[PDB]
C-alpha cells in the first residue's frame, strides 16, 4: 500500500485503541503512591482460592470486553467471517490484556494496580500459582523497560490480535495481508518517531501465548469457561 | 457402561435442577403479567425508534438470555468434561437456539403477544428491526411451541439436547459428545414415558428449523456490527 494508506492505518489503529483503553494512563500513574498496607495484603492473602479466582476472572472478562471492542473498531477485523473473528479473539484477546497490563504495573516497586491500590505479587497468593504470578510480573517488568507510548501499545496490540499464525483460520491469506499492513504501519510509525530500537527488544512471541494459556487452564480448573465466552 | 434406572433418574434430576437454577425468569412472574399489555401509543413509541436503538435492545436481551443458557450448560457435569473447543462449538451453535425455545414461556398464545421490557406486546412492537418476516416467523414458532403446553422439566430436558448435539460441525471429540447426547436422550424419553408425555416427541420442531431462525438473527446482528452474541462485548 501507499504512504497515505499506511499513515491512515496508523491513525485508525491508535484512534480505536484510544477509545477502548479502559483506564486512562494518567489515572494509573497518579495512583502509584497509593500502596496496600501489610494488613490489606494479608486480608487478600487469606481469601479463599475460589474468591480470588472469581475476582481475577471478573477483571479478565471486563478487560477482554474492552479488547473485543478494540478489535471491532479495526475495519480490517469487521471484514473477516465470524469463525475467523472468534479464532482471533479466542487466542489473542487475553494476550492483549496481558500487554495492556504493563500500564498498570509500577517497575520502581514491582507492584500492580489492583482494586484501588498498588500491590506486589504476594497479593495474589491465594491464586495458588505463585510461579505463574511471578512470571507475569517479570513479563510486565520487561514491558515497562521499553517505555511504550499509548500509540506503540495500540500498534503492537493490533499485531498481537491480527495474527495469521492462529490455528483454525479460514481466510488465512486475508489475515496475512491485514497483518502485513499492520507491521508496515508499526514499522513506519517507529521510524518516524526514532523508536525502531524497540523492535529487537519486544518479548519472544510464544511467551505471551504461554502466559495466557496457563491462565485459561487455571480458569478452567476453577470452572470458568474461556473468558471470551459470555458467562455470569 | 449402560446407565442403570438409578443413573438415568439421577440424570433427569440433575438436568432439571440446572434448568431450574438458570431459568432466568420464573414462569409464575411471566404468567401473572399477561393482563399487562402495551397501549397503542406505547406500541408506536417502539415502532418509531431507530433501527440501531431496537437492535441494541434486542442484542442486549439476547446476550443476557445467552448468559443464563451458558450457566445452564456449565451445570451439566457432562459439559464441563468437554474440551474448550467443543464447549465453544456447542454454545456458538446452540445457546441462542435454547433462548428461542425458552422464549415460549414469555409468549401468550391467546393474543400472540410476548413479554418485552415490562409489558406484553404483539410482533408489530418489533417493526423498527426491519425484518418483519423473520419476526413473524419467530412468533409462529413460539405459537407452535406453546401448543405443546411444556412443563419446566420438559423445557429442561429438551434444551439440554438442543445444546448437547453431536452433529455440530467442528467438534473434535465427537465420541464424547455422542455419549453425553445418548444419555440425555434416555433421560428425556424416560421422563416423558413416566409422565405419559411421549406424544410430544413427534411434535417437536423439525431438524434445522431452530438453526435457521438463529442463523437469521446472528446475520442481522452481524449487519448491525455485533459479533456472535456468545462473544463477550461492550457491557
Ligand atoms: C489490563 C488492565 C487495564 C489496562 C486497566 C484495569 C486493570 C483492572 O482490571 O483493574 C488493572 C489491573 C489488571 C492488570 C487488569 C486486568 C487483568 C489483570 C490480572 C487479573 C491478569 C492476570 C495476572 O496474573 C494478575 C492476577 C496478576 C492480574 C492482576 C492485575 C489485573 C486485574 C486491567
Ligand atoms: C428467553 C426469555 C427469558 C426466558 C425471560 C426474559 C426475556 C427477556 O429478555 O425479557 C423475555 C422476552 C424474550 C423472549 C427473551 C429473550 C430474547 C427475546 C427476543 C429478542 C428474541 C428474538 C425475537 O426476534 C424477538 C425480537 C421477538 C424477542 C423479543 C423478546 C425476548 C426479549 C427473554
d(CA A96, CA A119): 22
- Per DSSP, helices labelled H in B49-131 are 51-74, 77-81, 84-102
Task: Give the DSSP H/E element, type plus range, for residue B107.
Answer: strand B107-108
A59 alpha carbon – ligand 1 mean position (Å): 6
Residue A7, Cβ density class (10 Å: 0-12 exposed, 13-18 middle, ≥19 buried) = middle
Task: Assign A121 to helix, strand or coil.
Answer: helix
d(CA A46, CA A126): 7
d(CA A134, CA A126): 13
Task: Assign B229 to helix, strand or coil.
Answer: coil
Task: Give the DSSP H/E element, type plus range, for residue B115.
Answer: strand B113-116
d(CA B75, CA B78): 9
- Phi/psi class of residue B3: alpha, beta or left (left: φ > 0; alpha: ψ in -120 to 50)? beta
* Ranges assigned E (strand) in A102-216: 105-106, 111-114, 117-119
d(CA A114, CA B219): 39
Task: Give the DSSP H/E element, type plus range, for residue A64.
Answer: helix A49-72
Q: How many CA atoms lie within 13 A of B79 on its CB side?
A: 28
Residue A201, all three cell numbers:
527488544
Residues of B in contact with A232 (CB under 8 A): 67-68, 70-71
Domain encompassing residue A70: 1-232
d(CA B193, CA B187): 10
d(CA A182, CA A177): 9
Q: Contact, B99 vs B71, CB < 8 A?
A: no
- Phi/psi class of residue B109: alpha, beta or left (left: φ > 0; alpha: ψ in -120 to 50)? alpha
Residue A56, all three cell numbers:
481475577
d(CA A32, CA A17): 23
Proximal ligand: closest to the CA of B100? 2
d(CA A219, CA A54): 9
Instruction: Decide whether any atom of ligand 1 lies within 6 Å of the A224 Cβ.
Output: no
Count how many residues are written for chain A: 232
d(CA B223, CA B215): 12
- Method in brief: X-ray
Q: Sort strands A111-114 and A105-106 into parallel, antiparallel or unpaired.
A: antiparallel
Q: How many CA atoms lie within 13 A of B54 on its CB side?
A: 20
**Helix, strand and coil percent figures for chain A, each rounded to 5:** 70, 5, 25
Rg from Cα positions in chain B: 18
Instruction: Decide whether any atom of ligand 2 lies within 6 Å of the B65 Cβ.
Output: yes
Residue A21, all three cell numbers:
483503553
Show which residues on chain B lie within 8 Å of chain A, measured between beta carbons: 63, 66-68, 70-71, 74, 80, 84, 87-88, 91-92, 218, 222, 225, 227-235
> At CA B9, angle to CA B4 and CA B11, rounded to 5?
95
What are the Cα distances from residue A44, in Å, to A2, A48, B60, B175, B176?
Answer: 53, 9, 34, 43, 40
The residue with cell 510480573 is A137
Picking from A126, A151, A198, A221, the residue whose alpha carbon sits closest to that of residue A7 is: A151
Count how many residues are written for chain B: 235
Q: Using the Cα atoms of residue B28, residue B31, residue B34 and residue B35 in order, give the sign of their dihedral.
A: negative
Residues 6+ apart with CB under 8 A from A187: A196, A199
Resolution, given in Å to one decimal, reads: 2.2
What residues pair up with A111 in beta bridges, in sequence order? A106
Q: How many CA atoms lie within 13 A of B190 on its CB side?
A: 17
Residues of B in contact with A68 (CB under 8 A): 227, 231-234
The residue with cell 500502596 is A35
d(CA B71, CA B22): 7
Q: What is the DSSP letter of B200?
A: G
d(CA A222, CA B115): 36
Q: How large is the angle between the packed helices A150-161 and A49-72, nearest 10 degrees?
A: 90
> Domains in chain B: how many in total?
1
**Helix, strand and coil percent figures for chain B, each rounded to 5:** 70, 5, 25
d(CA B180, CA B166): 9
- Other Cβ atoms closer than 10 A to B231: 24
Cβ–Cβ below 8 Å for B67 and A225:
no
d(CA A110, CA A108): 6
Q: Contact, B183 vs B8, CB < 8 A?
A: yes
d(CA B40, CA B42): 5
Burial A18-52 (b: 16+ CB within 10 A, else e): eebbbeeeeebeebeeeebeeeebeebeebeeeeb
What residues pair up with A106 in beta bridges, in sequence order? A111
For residue A91, give the chain B residue with the closest CA. B85
Q: Contact, A72 vs B233, CB < 8 A?
A: yes
What order of strands is seen across the sheet that includes strand A105-106? A105-106, A111-114, A117-119
User: For position A217, which CATH number holds?
Assistant: 1.10.565.10
Task: Assign B230 to helix, strand or coil.
Answer: coil
Amino acid at each position: 500500500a501507499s504512504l497515505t494508506e499506511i499513515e491512515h492505518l496508523v491513525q485508525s489503529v491508535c484512534k480505536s485503541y484510544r477509545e477502548t483503553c479502559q483506564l486512562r494512563l494518567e489515572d494509573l500513574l497518579r495512583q502509584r503512591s497509593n500502596i496496600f498496607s501489610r494488613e490489606e495484603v494479608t486480608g487478600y492473602q487469606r481469601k479463599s482460592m475460589w474468591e480470588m479466582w472469581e475476582r481475577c476472572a471478573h477483571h479478565l472478562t471486563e478487560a477482554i470486553q474492552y479488547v473485543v471492542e478494540f478489535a471491532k473498531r479495526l475495519s480490517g477485523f469487521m471484514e473477516l467471517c465470524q469463525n475467523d473473528q472468534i479464532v482471533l479473539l479466542k487466542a489473542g484477546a487475553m494476550e492483549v490484556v496481558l500487554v495492556r497490563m504493563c500500564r498498570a504495573y509500577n517497575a520502581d516497586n514491582r507492584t500492580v494496580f489492583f482494586e484501588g491500590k498498588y500491590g506486589g505479587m504476594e497479593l495474589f497468593r491465594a491464586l495458588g500459582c505463585s510461579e505463574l504470578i511471578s512470571s507475569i510480573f517479570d513479563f510486565s517488568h520487561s514491558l515497562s523497560a521499553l517505555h511504550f507510548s499509548e500509540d506503540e501499545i495500540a500498534l503492537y496490540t493490533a499485531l498481537v490480535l491480527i495474527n495469521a499464525h492462529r490455528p483454525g483460520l479460514q481466510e488465512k491469506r486475508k489475515v496475512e495481508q491485514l497483518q502485513y499492513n499492520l507491521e508496515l504501519a508499526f514499522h513506519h510509525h517507529l521510524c518516524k518517531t526514532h523508536r525502531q530500537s524497540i523492535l529487537a527488544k519486544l518479548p519472544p512471541k510464544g511467551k505471551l501465548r504461554s502466559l495466557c494459556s496457563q491462565h485459561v487452564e487455571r480458569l478452567q480448573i476453577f470452572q470458568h469457561l474461556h473468558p471470551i465466552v459470555v458467562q455470569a
